[PDB]
């Protein structure tokens, strides 16, 4: 420990840079929420989207289905005579997650404002080939690389609060009536691309590739068993009265 | 119960801050005297570790949900009586309507 620093530089650099990066992240998040815009939806695209969801749930949950009704559904989807997939046919800079440019600009402005500065030292032993990285404005060759400048301080700061931001924020799930509309919107946003023919053919062949295994036949497992949960359960239902 | 845990967490954080202030004062005194390369006293180090462990205990108890993996137990107490009626289709033709007409 050396290089006795002033107490009036830590109160005008560290707290300002921390608050700046925190509120810059908050601004970015809230502005991203604000700029989000809904997408126009045609009733037809919603229609094939829901048809695809129906085929998917048929593929996923098909064990608990009467065999006759299962082949009825499979034939209706396939129907080699007419078929619904076969005839019903429709007709047919480099912005990449822009979050690096703002942080780079902020770091560049912060480094431009502070020319010759010593913010804090890092306990971690660092090599001398990272000295041009870290100081960038201090004319010292005998000094160690532990003492970093404000640029690296802010660069480590933006990653320090990356997981902290999610602590304050979170996910939301409400509006049961609007939940269905959200599901249709997202599902048809999945089904935007105009490749209906190949998707229909792929689903048509995939549905044939599925087999049937009635999971309802295995009933004998339950018959030879013990029913004791239904009274520990029944004991804890009695105490509650009627409001 | 959660209020007690929150208060305990706050008290632990305050104790940690006080230990930090004591260590800062110790280092400020150390900068005064030449050489004397000694470490900070062990009593404050034990106090700050006690504050570290105490706040670490309530931070786990504050956010405990641990909801059941099985979804059959969440539609288990629900009866078919409530499921039969739906918010979408609602006919306003009942005898209670004309029974409650006059009061």
């Amino acid at each position: 420990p050396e290089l006795l620093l002033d107490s009036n530089i830590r109160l005008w650099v560290v707290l300002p840079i921390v608050i700046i990066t925190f509120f810059v992240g908050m601004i970015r998040h809230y502005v991203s929420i604000l700029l989000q815009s809904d997408k126009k939806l045609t009733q037809e695209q919603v229609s094939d989207s829901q048809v695809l969801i129906r085929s998917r749930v048929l593929r996923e949950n098909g064990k608990y289905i009467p065999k006759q009704s299962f082949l009825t559904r499979k034939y209706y989807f396939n129907n080699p005579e007419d078929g619904f997939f076969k005839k019903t046919k429709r007709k047919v800079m480099k912005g990449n997650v822009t979050n690096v440019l703002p942080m780079i600009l902020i770091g560049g402005w912060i480094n431009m404002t502070f020319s010759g500065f010593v913010t804090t030292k890092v306990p971690f032993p660092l090599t001398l080939r990272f000295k041009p990285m870290l100081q960038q404005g201090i004319e010292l060759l005998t000094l160690d690389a532990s003492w970093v400048s404000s640029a690296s301080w802010y660069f480590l700061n933006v990653f320090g609060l990356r997981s902290i931001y999610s602590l304050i924020l979170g996910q939301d799930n409400a509006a049961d009536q609007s939940r269905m509309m959200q599901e249709q919107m997202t599902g048809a946003a999945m089904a935007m691309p105009a490749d209906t023919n190949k998707a229909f053919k792929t689903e048509w062949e995939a549905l044939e590739l599925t087999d049937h295994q009635w999971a309802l036949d295995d009933v004998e497992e339950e018959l030879m068993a013990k029913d004791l949960h239904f009274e520990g359960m029944f004991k804890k239902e009695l105490q509650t009265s009627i409001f | 119960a959660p209020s007690l845990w929150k208060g305990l967490v706050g008290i632990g954080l305050f104790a940690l801050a006080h230990a930090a202030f004591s260590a800062a004062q110790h280092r400020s005194y150390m900068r005064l005297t030449e050489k004397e390369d000694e470490s900070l006293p062990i009593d404050i180090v034990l106090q700050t570790l006690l504050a570290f462990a105490v706040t670490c205990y309530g931070i786990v108890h504050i956010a405990g949900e641990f909801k059941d993996m099985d979804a059959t137990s969440e539609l288990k107490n629900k009866t078919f009586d409530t499921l039969r009626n739906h918010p979408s289709f609602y006919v306003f033709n009942h005898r209670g309507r004309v029974l409650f007409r006059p009061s």
Binding site: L71, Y76, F130 | -
Partner: protein, 95 residues
């Protein structure tokens, strides 16, 4: 029958229903098992990581030997992708 005494009986007297079909249309029997194409496809999937290295070699050459933030950040994530892909090879191997 009279043994049950109370016996309530219920009788039932354009094709708009979606899937309900008047004609039953049984006689479906599909036996298709084509494992060689699946094996060829899955064999080519495991060859992707081997081919994903040459262009990162070319990119590291284009990066040069200039100590700067952009190249060192490219190099830090260049090796992170394999090690992050090597943390869950058990599930991929099992599937």
């Amino acid at each position: 029958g009279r043994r049950f005494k109370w016996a309530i009986e219920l009788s039932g007297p354009s094709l708009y229903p979606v899937g309900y079909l008047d004609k039953q249309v049984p006689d479906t029997s599909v036996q298709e098992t084509d494992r060689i194409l699946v094996e060829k496809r899955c064999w080519d999937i495991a060859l992707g990581p081997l081919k994903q290295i040459p262009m990162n070699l070319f990119i590291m050459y284009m990066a040069g030997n200039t100590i700067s933030i952009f190249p060192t950040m490219m190099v830090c994530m260049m090796a992170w992708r394999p090690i992050q892909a090597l943390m869950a090879i058990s599930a991929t191997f099992k599937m």
